[PDB]
Amino acid sequence: SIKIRDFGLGSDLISLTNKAGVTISFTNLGARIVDWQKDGKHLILGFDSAKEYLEKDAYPGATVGPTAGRIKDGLVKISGKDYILNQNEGPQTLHGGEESIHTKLWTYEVTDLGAEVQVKFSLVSNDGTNGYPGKIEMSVTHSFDDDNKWKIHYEAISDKDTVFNPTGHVYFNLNGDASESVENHGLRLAASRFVPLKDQTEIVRGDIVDIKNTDLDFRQEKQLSNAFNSNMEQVQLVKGIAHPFLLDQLGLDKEQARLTLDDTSISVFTDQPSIVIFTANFGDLGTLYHEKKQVHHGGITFECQVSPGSEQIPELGDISLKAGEKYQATTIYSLHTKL
Amino acid sequence: SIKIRDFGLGSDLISLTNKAGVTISFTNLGARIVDWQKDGKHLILGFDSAKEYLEKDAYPGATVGPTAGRIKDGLVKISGKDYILNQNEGPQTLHGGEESIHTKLWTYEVTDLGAEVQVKFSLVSNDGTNGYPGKIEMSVTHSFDDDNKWKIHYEAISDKDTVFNPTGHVYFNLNGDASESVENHGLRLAASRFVPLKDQTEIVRGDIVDIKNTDLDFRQEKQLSNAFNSNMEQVQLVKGIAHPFLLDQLGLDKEQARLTLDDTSISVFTDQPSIVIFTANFGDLGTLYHEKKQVHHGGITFECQVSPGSEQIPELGDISLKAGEKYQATTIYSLHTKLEHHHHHH
Ligand SMILES: OC[C@H]1O[C@@H](O)[C@H](O)[C@@H](O)[C@H]1O
Ligand SMILES: OC[C@H]1O[C@H](O)[C@H](O)[C@@H](O)[C@H]1O
Ligand code: NA
Numbered sequence: 279s280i281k282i283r284d285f286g287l288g289s290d291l292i293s294l295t296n297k298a299g300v301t302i303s304f305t306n307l308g309a310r311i312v313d314w315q316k317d318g319k320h321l322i323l324g325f326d327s328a329k330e331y332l333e334k335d336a337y338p339g340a341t342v343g344p345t346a347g348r349i350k351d352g353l354v355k356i357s358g359k360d361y362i363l364n365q366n367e368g369p370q371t372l373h374g375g376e377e378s379i380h381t382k383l384w385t386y387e388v389t390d391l392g393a394e395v396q397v398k399f400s401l402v403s404n405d406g407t408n409g410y411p412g413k414i415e416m417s418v419t420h421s422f423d424d425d426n427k428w429k430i431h432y433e434a435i436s437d438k439d440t441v442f443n444p445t446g447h448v449y450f451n452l453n454g455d456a457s458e459s460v461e462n463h464g465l466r467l468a469a470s471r472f473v474p475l476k477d478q479t480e481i482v483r484g485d486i487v488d489i490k491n492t493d494l495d496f497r498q499e500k501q502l503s504n505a506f507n508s509n510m511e512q513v514q515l516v517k518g519i520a521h522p523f524l525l526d527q528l529g530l531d532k533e534q535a536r537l538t539l540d541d542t543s544i545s546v547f548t549d550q551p552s553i554v555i556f557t558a559n560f561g562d563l564g565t566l567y568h569e570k571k572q573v574h575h576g577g578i579t580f581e582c583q584v585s586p587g588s589e590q591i592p593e594l595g596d597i598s599l600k601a602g603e604k605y606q607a608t609t610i611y612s613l614h615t616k617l
Numbered sequence: 618s619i620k621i622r623d624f625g626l627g628s629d630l631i632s633l634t635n636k637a638g639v640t641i642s643f644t645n646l647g648a649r650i651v652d653w654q655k656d657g658k659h660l661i662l663g664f665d666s667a668k669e670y671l672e673k674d675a676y677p678g679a680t681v682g683p684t685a686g687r688i689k690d691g692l693v694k695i696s697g698k699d700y701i702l703n704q705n706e707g708p709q710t711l712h713g714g715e716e717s718i719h720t721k722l723w724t725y726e727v728t729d730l731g732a733e734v735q736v737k738f739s740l741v742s743n744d745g746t747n748g749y750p751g752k753i754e755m756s757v758t759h760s761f762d763d764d765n766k767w768k769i770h771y772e773a774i775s776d777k778d779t780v781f782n783p784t785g786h787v788y789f790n791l792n793g794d795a796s797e798s799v800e801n802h803g804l805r806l807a808a809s810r811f812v813p814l815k816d817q818t819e820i821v822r823g824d825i826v827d828i829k830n831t832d833l834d835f836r837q838e839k840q841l842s843n844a845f846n847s848n849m850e851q852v853q854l855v856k857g858i859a860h861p862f863l864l865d866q867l868g869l870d871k872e873q874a875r876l877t878l879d880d881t882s883i884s885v886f887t888d889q890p891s892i893v894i895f896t897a898n899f900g901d902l903g904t905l906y907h908e909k910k911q912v913h914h915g916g917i918t919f920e921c922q923v924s925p926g927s928e929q930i931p932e933l934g935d936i937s938l939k940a941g942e943k944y945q946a947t948t949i950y951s952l953h954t955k956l957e958h959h960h961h962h963h
């Protein structure tokens with residue numbers, strides 16, 4: 279079943295319920311995921327109206343871009359030329375700059391396929407918007423099916439050579455409550471390397487590091503508290519995890535990651551080469567989710583994309599988008615329950 | 618009363634009914650007016666769904682900007698610097714550029730004041746968007762009251778020195794039928810001069826001309842057919858009217874224009890210095906409005922703003938907006954009945 283309702287400020291709430299009784303909700307404000315629930319329990323973090331996101335934290339569940347992550351000094355080079363993007367976190371351009379795409383009302387169309395329902399959100403980013411060459415016509419289709427697969431398919435075409443590398447910023451919390459650390463969940467991740475951060479500014483340090491046999495090797499499922507109680511300078515640096523992990527094997531068929539709590543597990547599939555993991559290291563901030571004060575470590579992201587820092591570490595990849603080339607990305611979050 | 622419902626593609630349709638029974642409705646797609654009816658008759662042109670605007674004509678009833686009209690070669694000078702804007706009409710920048718603000722979903726909040734209801738739409742134009750320095754925090758409030766006054770109030774603040782001069786693109790047609798020409802409407806307009814256009818590209822010629830005693834003199838009411846039938850060069854150039862009229866007396870207090878058909882009149886008030894009048898010179902295009910093929914001359918706009926061309930005719934005004942400075946503009950369209958005697962035939 280599909281239900282559409284007013285989410286506040288003119289945005290809509292589109293709720294989909296599959297054959298299994300599982301309900302996923304999205305809003306056009308930022309082409310985002312608002313809730314995901316089973317047997318009455320939220321699996322992800324989310325607010326109860328548009329205003330909240332605007333007032334509290336605009337990123338949760340949002341499609342962020344055009345470039346996800348931090349760009350040092352807001353500087354990219356396009357076809358040999360340097361371009362300075364909007365700078366919104368010191369000199370860095372973070373998630374596309376201020377008042378970026380996650381704060382806009384996207385247009386959308388719903389497509390009911392039966393076992394599968396698609397919600398296609400569309401937005402045009404004007405040439406020069408926040409310094410980005412365009413125009414860029416973007417669409418993000420979030421779909422939900424009877425097999426409990428929530429899939430995100432991105433597509434884009436630009437009139438000029440530009441940069442493009444968006445991501446989905448959903449925060450998972452299998453405890454169903456923000457006041458509860460995710461240190462009790464277990465994580466498995468098919469990555470033997472990561473990208474260390476230079477410092478508190480969170481720009482990349484410059485190198486690629488081997489994680490095998492360290493507190494960050496989740497190659498073998500392991501509990502989060504491990505990483506959390508590690509003395510590794512990198513962990514201590516951010517007070518948790520807030521880094522890109524390079525996947526060992528690329529391809530949409532491979533389960534790249536798994537997050538488990540009891541009988542409940544989320545499997546991550548993507549065609550992207552990297553996963554950025556941030557464990558809501560908010561300290562005492564205490565953002566309120568559903569009347570619950572959020573705790574340090576009260577959520578975790580799986581930002582699938584090309585790793586931030588390719589501006590200084592080219593090996594990471596190349597995020598350019600040539601005028602006329604069609605960009606495509608796919609990321610999937612599969613829900614499972616042991617019987 | 619106020620009613621809201623989905624209008625298509627994610628937009629809403631906000632419908633107000635005042636105490637007199639007059640209904641007006643807006644959509645956050647382009648912070649635009651969609652319809653205005655009296656006794657079941659449409660006083661304006663509009664479509665039935667959001668997709669119609671996107672597929673047929675995205676300008677009717679829309680808020681357009683950041684700069685309304687054509688900027689020759691998209692070139693503006695801001696604080697001694699030249700900036701080139703998006704060029705969407707040949708080398709010209711028409712109505713802020715391609716995929717401009719009239720194409721976006723604005724957020725909104727409704728305030729019920731009882732005798733007056735306000736719909737405040739908001740949008741942020743990012744710095745660099747279409748070439749304009751910013752960011753620009755914009756807001757358009759559309760309000761309707763028990764006195765049948767539809768009012769538009771614009772506010773804006775930029776982080777940087779930029780240019781701003783938006784307008785409202787409604788089209789009236791008192792026949793309530795697009796396939797009916799407005800040549801049968803009477804027009805009264807407090808303007809003695811106009812701005813001629815250089816040629817078919819529609820950029821300004823460079824001079825300001827006196828139109829008194831010509832077929833474009835509406836200081837004293839006359840049927841629109843007088844203009845439409847005129848063979849004056851400027852009229853033949855655009856096949857109707859499509860020019861800026863310079864108001865003789867400035868101020869929000871003055872009825873600068875009045876459009877009448879039989880017992881119904883629409884009065885125009887504004888704090889702007891000019892009214893750009895475009896009489897839907899589309900020839901045989903025949904855009905369908907409510908299933909009626911629109912006719913040449915099947916509608917008339919009253920775009921209140923600083924006249925286009927100030928880049929060339931500095932005398933028209935200054936559309937620059939300084940960083941931190943608050944822009945404001947107000948335009949009011951008020952409806953009346955039996956304001957005068959208008960009994961004609963065509
Ligand atoms: O505070 C650091 C974090 O900031 C977030 O906005 C970002 O999405 C995370 O991946 C992480 O880098
Ligand atoms: O074609 C000329 C015409 O073009 C557009 O529709 C404008 O909005 C009108 O004001 C007028 O200048
Ligand atoms: Na809605």
